[PDB]
Write a protein that binds this DNA or RNA. Structure first.
Length: 546
DNA sequence: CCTGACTCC
DNA sequence: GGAGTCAGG
């Protein structure tokens, strides 16, 4: 563990080389408007640590950051790019991202620091972040020399690991997936996160006021029907009321007690009317706790914007996730919750929300992969590997009839059935399954002698190529769309992605254009054996974009 | 801190 | 099948 570096007082010319590993350290998990605590640069000329108060107010260093011809290798470049946006500084020329590289090589490793990626190539001259900063209430930036060494060591690790990682991606035929898809997408996501979505707090607060009143009413009705006050939000207490006091049938148990899941309670409706009120209550309570209160807590008060973080290197299938707040699970199914969407508005006057969604993309993908003629044919002119039991329990119907449904289904679509058998066998033979754009998922459990473990792995083999291919497609669609927007000099920009949906905002005058441009780009992102179809709507709020 | 609830794709 | 947040405990 011996590594020389320069703890620099000012920026020098040799730090501004046209190829470098760069670390712009943001310690807080949520990097929006978060402090940059230190900077490290490793290049042909040496290793350098820089104070941010120094470097970020240096016109030549800012210049170098924003020069796309000066190439930087980094880890989680979106974190840096966004943290720098909040400092009023543009980051360009990121040519390698070790986080995304590690993610593509094996999503299951859960790589989320440089040390964890270095471990994939037995590189151990760098520490885990948690070891340096500590955890929870003990989390702290260490003394300068200790911080400086850690940052340089992370930069030095990125410097050395780039080629070994690119080399393995290439051998996997995933180099283009990184360089032409994930990396360009990262910059697009950074733009969306920094832009944020404006919220109508006056409307959200009034909705919360009315919701609190309604909750109270439902709450009292529940106590009356139960004959007792209890905590409805405690499955344990609720279980005692339903299955002991009221002696309702026990349909299901988990490891901690009686189940009170929505499925179960719906099945108990013929026994007592309290179960319908309880379901209603728990829906309203989630609206209040999460989509009123939890959302207001994360609104930036001066601008009324919420800024999500799209985790690009988390899910096992290639999807994004969205955190703090999650803007990919805003209610829509019930009118009561859907009204939440009225609080999501355009960031400027006389702008509108535009939403476009793929129709049944996973089913069209399956049609392509399996080359099922009947399914391909139907599309030219159901999501349930569900069993006869789950189907019966889902439709509240006969398990015998459910069995017959699945049987008939595979009769009609023998190509899908063939595919399901073949992809499982391939997974056992190779140890992983792959998506259209060569994303991979390893399935080491697929030959377990244990039935449950093996079965779950086989269902991943069936689902991951379909769900992951759909993720591939929409990611490419975002990249294509961005370019087309910039080419035509539209003011419209992306705000959100919701798996198979893109949400933008734009001047009212641009709807006519987007109505043609967005769907076309999305549909032409890849060419399958069946067509892609996209639906679209625009409005004064997210609610009205329907 | 985990579990089981609601929310979306 | 893939996710995140919340209250309760």
């Amino acid at each position: 563990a011996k590594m020389a570096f320069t703890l620099a007082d000012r920026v020098t010319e040799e730090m501004l080389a046209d190829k470098a590993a760069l670390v712009v350290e943001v310690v807080e998990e949520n990097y929006h408007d978060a402090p940059i605590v230190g900077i490290a640069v490793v290049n042909e000329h040496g290793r350098f640590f820089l104070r941010p108060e120094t470097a970020l107010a240096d016109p030549q260093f800012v210049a170098w950051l924003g020069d796309e011809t000066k190439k930087k290798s980094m880890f989680d470049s979106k974190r840096a790019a966004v943290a720098l946006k909040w400092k009023g500084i543009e980051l360009c020329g990121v040519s390698f991202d070790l986080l995304l590289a590690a993610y593509l090589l094996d999503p299951a490793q859960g790589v989320d620091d440089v040390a964890a990626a270095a471990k994939m190539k037995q590189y151990e001259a760098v520490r885990p972040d948690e070891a340096v900063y500590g955890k929870g209430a003990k989390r702290a930036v260490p003394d300068e020399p200790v911080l400086a060494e850690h940052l340089v060591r992370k930069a030095a690790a990125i410097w050395e690991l780039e080629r070994p990682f690119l080399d393995e991606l290439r051998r996997n035929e995933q180099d283009r997936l990184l360089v032409e898809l994930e990396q360009p997408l990262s910059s697009i996501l950074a733009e969306m996160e920094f832009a944020g979505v404006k919220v109508d707090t006056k409307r959200l607060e009034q909705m919360g006021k009315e919701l609190a009143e309604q909750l109270g009413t439902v709450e009292q009705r529940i106590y009356e029907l139960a004959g007792q006050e209890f905590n409805i939000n405690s499955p344990k207490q609720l279980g005692v009321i339903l299955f002991e006091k009221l002696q309702l049938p026990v349909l299901k148990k988990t490891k901690t007690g009686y189940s009170t899941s929505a499925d179960v309670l719906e099945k108990l409706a013929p026994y007592h009317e309290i179960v319908e009120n309880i379901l209603h209550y728990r829906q309203l309570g989630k609206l209040q706790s999460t989509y009123i209160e939890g959302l207001l807590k994360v609104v930036r008060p001066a601008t009324k914007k919420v800024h999500t973080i799209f985790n690009q290197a988390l899910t096992q299938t290639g999807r994004l996730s969205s955190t703090e707040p999650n803007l990919q699970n805003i209610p829509i199914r019930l009118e009561e919750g859907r009204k939440i969407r009225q609080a999501f508005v355009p960031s400027e006057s006389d702008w509108l929300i535009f939403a476009a969604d793929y129709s049944q993309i996973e089913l069209r993908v399956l049609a392509h992969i399996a080359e099922d003629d009947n399914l391909m044919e139907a599309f030219r002119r159901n999501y349930g590997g569900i069993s006869d039991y789950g189907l019966a329990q889902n439709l509240n119907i006969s398990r015998k009839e459910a069995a017959e449904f699945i049987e008939r289904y595979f009769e009609s679509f023998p190509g899908v059935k063939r595919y399901m058998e073949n992809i499982v066998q391939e997974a056992k033979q190779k140890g992983y399954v792959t998506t259209l754009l060569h994303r991979r998922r390893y399935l080491p459990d697929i030959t377990s002698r244990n039935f449950n473990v093996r079965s779950f792995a086989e269902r991943m083999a069936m689902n991951t190529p379909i769900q992951g291919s759909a993720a591939d497609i929409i990611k490419k669609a975002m990249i294509d769309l961005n370019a087309r927007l910039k080419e035509e000099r539209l003011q419209a920009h992306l705000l959100l992605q919701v798996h198979d949906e893109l949400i933008l905002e734009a001047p009212k005058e641009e709807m006519e254009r987007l109505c043609r441009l967005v769907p076309e780009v999305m549909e032409q992102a890849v060419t399958l054996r069946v067509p892609l179809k996209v639906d679209y709507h625009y409005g004064s709020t997210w609610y009205d974009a329907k």
